[PDB]
Amino acid sequence: QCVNLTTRTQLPPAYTNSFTRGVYYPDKVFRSSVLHSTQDLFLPFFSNVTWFHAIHKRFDNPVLPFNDGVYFASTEKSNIIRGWIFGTTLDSKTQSLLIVNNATNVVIKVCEFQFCNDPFLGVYYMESEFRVYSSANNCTFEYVSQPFLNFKNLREFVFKNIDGYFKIYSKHTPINLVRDLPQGFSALEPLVDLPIGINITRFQTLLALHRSGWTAGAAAYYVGYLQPRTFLLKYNENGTITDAVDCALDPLSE
Amino acid sequence: QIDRLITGRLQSLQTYVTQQLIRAAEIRASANLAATKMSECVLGQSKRVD
Amino acid sequence: QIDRLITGRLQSLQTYVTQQLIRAAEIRASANLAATKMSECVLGQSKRVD
Amino acid sequence: DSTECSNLLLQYGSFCTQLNRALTGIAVEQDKNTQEVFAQVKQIYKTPP
Amino acid sequence: DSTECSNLLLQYGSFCTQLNRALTGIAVEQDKNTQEVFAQVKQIYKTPPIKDFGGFNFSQILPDPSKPSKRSPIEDLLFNKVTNGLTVLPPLLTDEMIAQYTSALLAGTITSGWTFGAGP
Amino acid sequence: TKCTLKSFTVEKGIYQTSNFRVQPTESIVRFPNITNLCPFGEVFNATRFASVYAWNRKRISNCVADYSVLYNSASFSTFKCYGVSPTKLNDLCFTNVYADSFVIRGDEVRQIAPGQTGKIADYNYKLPDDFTGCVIAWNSNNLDSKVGGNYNYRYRLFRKSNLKPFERDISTEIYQAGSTPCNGVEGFNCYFPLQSYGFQPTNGVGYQPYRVVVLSFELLHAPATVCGPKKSTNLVKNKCVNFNFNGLTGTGVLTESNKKFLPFQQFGRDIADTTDAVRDPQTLEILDITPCSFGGVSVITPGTNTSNQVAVLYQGVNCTEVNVFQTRAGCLIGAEHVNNSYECDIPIGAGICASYQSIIA
Ligand SMILES: *[C@@H]1O[C@H](CO)[C@@H](O[C@@H]2O[C@H](CO)[C@@H](O)[C@H](O)[C@H]2NC(C)=O)[C@H](O)[C@H]1NC(C)=O
Ligand SMILES: *[C@@H]1O[C@H](CO)[C@@H](O[C@@H]2O[C@H](CO)[C@@H](O)[C@H](O)[C@H]2NC(C)=O)[C@H](O)[C@H]1NC(C)=O
Ligand SMILES: *[C@@H]1O[C@H](CO)[C@@H](O)[C@H](O)[C@H]1NC(C)=O
Ligand SMILES: *[C@@H]1O[C@H](CO)[C@@H](O)[C@H](O)[C@H]1NC(C)=O
Ligand SMILES: *[C@@H]1O[C@H](CO)[C@@H](O)[C@H](O)[C@H]1NC(C)=O
Ligand SMILES: *[C@@H]1O[C@H](CO)[C@@H](O)[C@H](O)[C@H]1NC(C)=O
Ligand SMILES: *[C@@H]1O[C@H](CO)[C@@H](O)[C@H](O)[C@H]1NC(C)=O
Ligand SMILES: *[C@@H]1O[C@H](CO)[C@@H](O)[C@H](O)[C@H]1NC(C)=O
Ligand SMILES: *[C@@H]1O[C@H](CO)[C@@H](O)[C@H](O)[C@H]1NC(C)=O
């Protein structure tokens, strides 16, 4: 089942500065009171990150290239964003990786789904409306884990596709800032590696509608792009990354 | 593969030992100067300027 | 082929740097001697023979 | 300008860093040598006319 | 701990012997350097208990008996301001021994001028 | 000393002759628990098996398979592997496993083999010439057979063309034995291709039903989720052992640590990027790795013209790990420590010297 949305209001996409966010642990190696320099796919310091709005009327669910990596940030309240769609052609021709989070748990599947032109969920003022797919023919991998989930919760996510492994880094940060990304440092701990071994070149975010026609929940998220560069990471005595330096930002950091 | 590793590590060790020898020659020159200063400034009064 | 060229050129560069370090040590000894001569012959009158 | 050669050279470790550091040390040592030989007075004396 | 690697390394002859010999030469040269700099007197001199040197005050350079290390205040400050088959060999002279050399040199030059450097 | 110096006369001094190494006592292999087992109980010993012309394809992936348990069962009268070794199944890793289960006649069991041509090989199940995996077959005369005759199993007897490898054909199109045209209507030379099996208890060996499970292995670029079991042994601490933690191996002394790893971290490294702490996969406790106490072995000797007595210095080695005298330079063996003070004859290090008067320190 698919439903067209013909009550949107036209608005060009926005941009904002990444500030000092997007740093994650490159590997599972502990380090104490050591300054470590590594070369890995990182989100550059002070770079423009594409800004999407969802406010009553805006509903932004486009299809974007994966490229070499994606940094996803979400100032999330009332849990509007529920999952992500991963694949190349977004139809039955190829195979897709599905990441969803419904009312019970998170389901991670690798199947050849049929995707709607407008995939979304539905909330009735209880969740009783699922219209994101119409068929599921050939499955090859299914995985179940525990759920990951004014603005009161900020979610950061980094997705990578190297050697067929899908690495998910995350960090739950409580903030109280109204509109834009806050200023600070927060390293994204790895959550789970998915040995999927499939081709991914595109992605799409999954939202949820409100019924009372449809009403757009108030939300805003960001999508960045990973660029391979060198970082100088600081590890404190407790072993967590407290500050970082981009070696190719400006001559002082170099 | 082990032969490649052995050549690399032996080259690294030789590089270390060579630069250690050069630094040791510099430190020996400095220590000879320090012994001369000990003899001529501490154990006597020197008329040598500076 | 690049590995052959890399090891050859790295060996050449390491040899050059080693010669430059040894020559720099010799020139530093000469410059220390020259500074001593400036102090003890230009800035003063030396009783040291020759 | 060969990027493949540089990628292969990265597997050899910090040899290039060591050589660059040694050459930089020699370069600053030359200036130190000239400084020690010639800058033995902080006052610029002039002969009478 | 690889036996095969050591068997392959045996093909290269005596390279390890050369490296160890050079490092041993450096190690003994360091101790020789310290001997030439500091062991210039065969007599361990002591200052008199009364520090009456005509108004001259050597407290900052004479050893401090209160400290466990028997180091002078300036020497104490100097020591405070300087901070896989690899072994570090300890020096032949300890820091206490080098400090005792410096104390002997200071006592000799304070109580006997340059005379102790040329004889009794 | 004479052999190191390549001389039959040794001058007075101290000479490094060899290297002391604390040889490891045990080998420790630590691996995470064997969890999320493969569902082999619902394949080999399920409720009902399928017919050969419509063989079910069971996919086994994202789990650990203990092929030794399946191998050591005595009820399996046939265990033939054509691309792998039966004893190496618990060590190798593969992307996914295809399991085909069906019922065939006793004499048709050997037709499931590469290079073998027969009714079942051509029209019911086809294997490639470069097939890999194991074919497991056992008799099922107590479960499939019925006194009234088990005719529920049908097998394809004729087809115009042979099956391609791993091809399923559930079609019931009428076979044309002769050249007479048939539009799906049976005639004198047009018969149904499926014939009911004659499994009976009165049938002897050869006509008894067999349940055959065929294992196929794939070696594509996808991650090899299917791996054999890991035999993690017990942990030994405070000793020089060869550890093996999740494939990272080395020699060292495993000791308790006060370092608090973040929960996602497994290994620890120092400023020089050497592994010095590891989290144990079985019990989540951080273990500190200290290298086994190696050192240089030095021999203190006067000239052979004077005496043949020697003293041995184990450089940087505690005396409990090798006239036993502990110095800051290391453990000194064979020299008696005296409270007197003399001028240095043979330098040991850290203010200690050795001389011959016996050899004193
Ligand atoms: C929602 O809208 C999209 C486009 O606005 C629809 O996609 C098109 O559907 C027509 C229907 O015949 C096709 O002819 C076009 O080829 C489709 N376009 C693309 C790019 O695929 C979509 O079908 C609509 N959803 C529903 C349920 O009608
Ligand atoms: C020599 O110098 C030392 C320090 O320069 C003098 O020690 C000081 O003595 C005064 C009073 O006598 C104290 O108030 C200071 O705190 C002392 N300073 C230190 C660092 O101890 C010492 O009195 C001087 N004279 C003699 C004869 O020793
Ligand atoms: C990011 O992109 C926007 C528009 O695409 C542009 O206005 C902005 O200057 C860019 N950021 C930087 C740092 O150049
Ligand atoms: C959430 O999705 C899973 C996946 O199919 C499903 O089994 C479960 O019933 C869903 N939860 C609810 C509340 O419907
Ligand atoms: C994928 O599904 C289509 C239709 O559902 C089917 O024709 C095809 O054989 C399937 N491929 C695999 C590899 O299962
Ligand atoms: C993945 O898909 C893209 C286009 O969707 C294609 O250009 C690329 O070659 C594919 N990669 C692989 C390894 O198949
Ligand atoms: C390290 O953690 C301890 C408790 O786990 C805490 O008391 C201390 O302040 C922390 N130090 C730093 C630098 O984060
Ligand atoms: C039936 O086969 C399964 C395969 O895993 C095995 O675990 C089970 O023990 C078998 N049943 C009997 C009675 O041996
Ligand atoms: C593994 O088994 C050990 C054995 O007692 C147990 O303590 C541990 O909780 C188990 N699970 C994990 C994840 O280590």
Residue numbers in the entry:
A (entry chain B): 14 to 69, 77 to 145, 153 to 176, 185 to 247, 257 to 298
B (entry chain B), C (entry chain C): 992 to 1041
D (entry chain C): 745 to 793
E (entry chain B): 745 to 827, 856 to 892
F (entry chain A): 299 to 620, 641 to 675, 691 to 694
Quote the paper:
SARS-CoV-2 utilizes a trimeric spike glycoprotein for attachment to the host cell receptor angiotensin-converting enzyme 2 (ACE2) and for the subsequent cell entry step which involves the fusion of host cell and viral membranes. Given its crucial role in the viral replicative cycle, the spike protein represents an important therapeutic target and is a critical antigen in host immune responses. Given the rapidly changing mutational and antigenic landscape of the SARS-CoV-2 spike protein, a structural understanding of spike protein mutational effects and the discovery of broadly neutralizing epitopes is of importance.
To this aim, ectodomains bearing variant spike mutations were used for cryo-EM structural studies. Global 3D reconstructions were obtained at resolutions ranging from (2.25–2.5 Å), yielding open trimers with one RBD in the up conformation and 2 RBDs in the down conformation for all spikes. In contrast, we were able to confidently model sidechains close to, and within the S2 domain, owing to its limited flexibility.
